[PDB]
């Protein structure tokens, strides 16, 4: 039994069956609460749920085959199972908040991809769209442990700790020492000798973040607005260590629209990048070019975080969700369309031990377990 709550933009029914288009208060999801979810994940006006059984459901805008349901034009208003993956136990779906493609990882380590095919982000040696999940052949002999997708590139890491990237090469977000597009997965050779345990991918002129099992965070790709975390705006196509975060116990990394976020094991949140519309959480909309602690959450032990395009969710260990950032479509959950300049307690979730959050482009999810 897992209760799932959604709010935010609903113009394409990306919330799985609620009336209205601006759900400004977290609303109980009948359909999603029924599935017994282990993960929810938001793309561009899209929503995916991975269930304990290992099945995947999808709803929202269907364009570019982003939902993987064998179509490419409508909206899918009620969460629908991705039958193409029904012979597999899926463990995780990786999709970006500004994303029109996704990947799914099985428990036995296989990676499928579907959706928009531009720049090779599906990893199939082509730029073709896949309306239905397709096995990434390049990785069949690799035991994949984690996956991520930006808007224009993808990543996957092995149980032994090697990171793979593929997709758009422009602005060096792939990390291979050049700006070349890769239509198949390619190993980030610079990071060999570090066991990479987590990776996160940005959108548009995108950054990439990696996390090693020693707590070192690396970044590379586009440098606009200081989302690389080393000051100024210079980009690089080779992973560099974000020195500010060493020794801090970073256990989760995320990439929204043009900014970066890190959570530590002690419960601290750091953000940096493009500040417009208050997506960083520091109470002003200025850019932050090296990681800064979200002060508005001192003393609250955050246990899970999620980012959308312009908003963030943080979950405390007592089951409270804090939101900050833009609110054009209600994705803050403060009952209005007013921006949350600071971390702001989310409304309508009392009596709920919320454990996990997720974000799409303009929508929000919180569930229990």
């Amino acid at each position: 039994r897992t209760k799932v709550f959604v709010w935010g933009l609903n113009d394409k029914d990306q919330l799985g069956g609620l009336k209205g288009s601006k759900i400004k208060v977290p609303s109980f999801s009948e359909t999603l609460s029924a599935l017994n979810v282990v993960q929810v994940a938001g793309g561009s006006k899209s929503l995916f749920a991975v269930t304990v059984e290992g099945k995947v459901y999808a709803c929202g805008e269907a364009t570019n085959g982003r939902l993987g349901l064998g179509i490419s034009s409508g909206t899918v208003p009620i969460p629908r199972q991705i039958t193409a993956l029904s012979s597999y136990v899926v463990k995780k779906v990786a999709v970006h908040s500004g994303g029109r493609h996704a990947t799914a990882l099985t428990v036995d380590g296989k990676v499928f991809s579907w959706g928009e095919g531009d720049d090779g982000k599906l990893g199939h040696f082509s730029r073709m769209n896949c309306d239905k999940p397709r096995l990434i052949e390049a990785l069949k002999t690799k035991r994949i442990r984690d996956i991520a997708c930006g808007s224009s590139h993808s990543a996957a890491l092995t149980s032994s700790g090697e990171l793979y990237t593929w997709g758009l090469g422009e602005y060096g977000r792939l990390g291979h020492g050049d700006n070349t597009t890769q239509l198949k997965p390619k190993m980030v050779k610079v990071l060999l000798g570090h066991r990479v345990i987590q990776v996160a991918c940005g959108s548009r002129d995108a950054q990439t973040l990696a996390l090693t099992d020693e707590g070192l965070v690396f970044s590379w790709g586009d440098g606009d607005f200081g989302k690389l975390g080393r000051g100024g705006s210079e980009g690089c196509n080779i992973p560099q260590n974000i020195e500010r975060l060493n020794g801090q116990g970073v256990c989760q990394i995320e990439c929204g629209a043009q900014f970066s976020l890190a959570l530590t094991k002690s419960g601290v949140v750091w953000t940096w990048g493009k500040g417009d519309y208050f997506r960083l959480g520091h109470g002003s909309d200025v850019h932050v070019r090296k990681p800064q602690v979200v002060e508005g959450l001192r003393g609250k032990k955050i246990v899970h975080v999620a980012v959308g395009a312009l908003h963030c969710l943080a979950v405390t260990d007592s089951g409270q969700v804090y939101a900050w950032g833009d609110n054009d479509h209600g994705q803050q959950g403060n009952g209005t369309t007013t921006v949350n300049r600071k971390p702001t307690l989310v409304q309508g979730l009392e009596g709920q031990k919320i454990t996990r959050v997720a974000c799409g482009s303009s929508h929000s999810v919180a569930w229990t377990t």
Partner: peptide, 9 residues
């Protein structure tokens, strides 16, 4: 903004 969705409803 390039990342602000629009409400097509």
């Amino acid at each position: 903004d390039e990342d602000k969705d629009k409400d097509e409803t």
